[PDB]
């Protein structure tokens, strides 16, 4: 049952410390991670309303010029499809995805979702079949018990991602946590069996993670890129970014990651009967962008795992 948040810093909210961190408004940082670009658009007219400041790097056109243009003009091939895929009032975790062409090598990956009357569009460069998830299910299904399932799950996720460390972190009723399974690079010190206080993942983080099942920090040293304008014109209120993987990570968590010597981090919620049961928590020693298709796979695996857990705890 999380505290209400304070205003974001850009609305004159207070600085975040270890005394008030459960009130950080992490879903509305007004900025993104610099390895992709983000636009927002009117969900009906398709008019481009906000743009990350770096958008020219990715889209090949100056942020000041793209604004106010409609998606029907900017994405003539994707706009109808995107409209149909994300109707008014659809779930905010529902996504449309397309891979577009661009002047730089490979493609751009486009991910879109809807919050209220706003569409949120994420672009990231890209260079995974249903088969990888399909093949994985077998060992997860054969695991004789919960601990075995967790061991299979982390090993499988490590094999699919290449991440230096993959943990299954399970929450206790006091919201403390414990590393119950771990697959890691040889010689990396074990976190297996270690317990952490509830404060390491504060209540508003756990609440968010029950709604939007995947979040990441691709470079624990990269500075965020502002959304311009920062508020949504539709509303003159902050833009909700919990549904965007590009969302800027809490600086408090960035520092936490750096203190651990973590270069890149990613986790997937394990949600059992609508409650946050735990996290598949992943680390890389250096910055790393997991491709969109792989993240999507990991999301589905998180759901598969949730159900298998729920099956075994009911045994």
Ligand X SMILES: *C/C=C1/C(=C/c2[nH]c(/C=C3[NH+]=C(/C=C4\NC(=O)C(C=C)=C4C)C(C)=C\3CCC(=O)O)c(CCC(=O)O)c2C)NC(=O)[C@H]1C
Interaction between residue 138 and a second copy (CB under 8 A): yes
Alpha carbon distance 307, 305 (integer Å): 5
Q: Which 8-state DSSP code applies to residue 222? A: P
Rounded to a whole number of angstroms, the minimum distance from the CB of residue 103 to ligand X is 32
252: cis peptide before it, omega within 30°?
no
The correct pick among 11, 53, 72, 93 for binding a second copy (CB under 8 A) is 93
Interaction between residue 184 and ligand X (CB under 6 A): no
Structure tokens at 294: 């792989």
Residue 312 phi/psi, 5° resolution? -75, -35
DSSP 142-182: H--SHHHHHHHHHHHHHHHH--SEEEEEEE-TTS-EEEEEE
Q: For residues 31 and 109, which CB has a smaller minimum distance to ligand X in the complex? A: 31
Interaction between residue 202 and ligand X (CB under 6 A): yes
Q: Tokens 């100056």 sit at which residue? A: 62
Interaction between residue 94 and a second copy (CB under 8 A): yes
Question: Which one of ligand X, a second copy, none is in contact with 252 (Cβ closer than 5 to 8 A by kind)?
Answer: ligand X
The correct pick among 8, 24, 219, 239 for binding ligand X (CB under 6 A) is 24
Contact mark string toward ligand X, 142..181, x via CB under 6 A? -----------------------------------x----
DSSP 58-91: HHSS-HHHHTT-BHHHHSTTTHHHHHHHS-TT--
Interaction between residue 295 and ligand X (CB under 6 A): no
Interaction between residue 281 and ligand X (CB under 6 A): yes
How many residues of this chain interact with ligand X, rule: CB under 6 A? 23
Alpha carbon distance 108, 126 (integer Å): 6
Binding span for ligand X by CB under 6 A among 45-53, 142-150, 156-164, 192-200: 192-200
Contacts made by residues 57-65, CB under 8 angstroms, sequence distance 24+: 58/102, 58/108, 58/123, 58/124, 58/125, 59/102, 59/123, 60/102, 60/103, 63/228
Interaction between residue 3 and ligand X (CB under 6 A): no
The correct pick among 134, 185, 194, 221 for binding a second copy (CB under 8 A) is 134
Interaction between residue 201 and ligand X (CB under 6 A): yes
Binding span for ligand X by CB under 6 A among 21-29, 36-44, 94-102, 222-230: 21-29
Q: Which 8-state DSSP code applies to residue 10? A: G
The correct pick among 14, 87, 91, 116 for binding a second copy (CB under 8 A) is 91
Order of strands, sheet of 275-284, starting from the edge strand that comes earlier in the sequence: 195-196, 177-184, 165-171, 275-284, 264-272, 214-217
How many residues of this chain interact with a second copy, rule: CB under 8 A? 27
Interaction between residue 88 and a second copy (CB under 8 A): no
Contact (Cβ atoms closer than 8 angstroms) between residue 38 and residue 120 = yes
282 carries a ligand binding annotation:
no
Alpha carbon distance 96, 306 (integer Å): 23
Binding residues for a second copy, rule: CB under 8 A, are 91, 93-95, 97, 128-131, 133-135, 137-138, 141, 293, 296-297, 299-300, 303-304, 307-308, 310-311, 314
Annotated binding-site residue numbers for a tetrapyrrole: 21
């Amino acid at each position: 049952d999380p505290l209400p948040f304070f205003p974001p810093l850009y609305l004159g909210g207070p600085e975040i410390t270890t005394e008030n961190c459960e009130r950080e408004p992490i879903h509305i940082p007004g900025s993104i991670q610099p390895h992709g670009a983000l636009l927002t658009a009117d969900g009906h007219s398709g008019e481009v309303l906000q743009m990350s400041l770096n958008a020219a790097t990715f889209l090949g056109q100056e942020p000041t010029v793209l604004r106010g243009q409609t998606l029907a003009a900017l994405l003539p091939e994707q706009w109808p499809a995107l409209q149909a895929a994300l109707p008014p009032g659809c779930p905010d975790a529902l996504q449309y995805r397309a891979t577009l062409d661009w002047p730089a090598a490979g493609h751009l990956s486009l991910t879109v979702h809807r919050v209220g009357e706003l569409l949120i569009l994420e672009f990231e460069p890209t260079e995974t079949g249903p088969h990888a998830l399909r093949n994985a299910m077998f060992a997860l299904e054969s695991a004789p018990n919960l601990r075995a399932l967790a061991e299979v799950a982390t090993q499988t996720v490590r094999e699919l991602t290449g991440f230096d460390r993959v943990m299954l972190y399970k929450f206790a009723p006091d919201a403390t946590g414990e590393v119950i399974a771990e697959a890691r690079r040889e010689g990396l010190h074990a976190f297996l069996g270690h317990r952490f206080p509830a404060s390491d993942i504060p209540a508003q983080a756990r609440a968010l993670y029950t709604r939007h099942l995947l979040r990441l920090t691709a470079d624990t040293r990269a500075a965020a890129v502002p959304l311009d304008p920062v508020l949504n014109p539709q509303t003159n209120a902050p833009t909700p970014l919990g549904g965007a993987v590009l969302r800027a990570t809490s600086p408090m968590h960035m520092q936490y990651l750096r203190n651990m010597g973590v270069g890149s981090s990613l986790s997937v919620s394990v949600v059992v009967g609508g409650q946050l049961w735990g996290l598949i928590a992943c680390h890389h020693q250096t910055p790393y962008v997991l491709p969109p298709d792989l993240r999507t796979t990991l999301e589905s695996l998180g759901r598969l795992l949730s159900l298998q857990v729920q099956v075994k705890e009911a045994h």
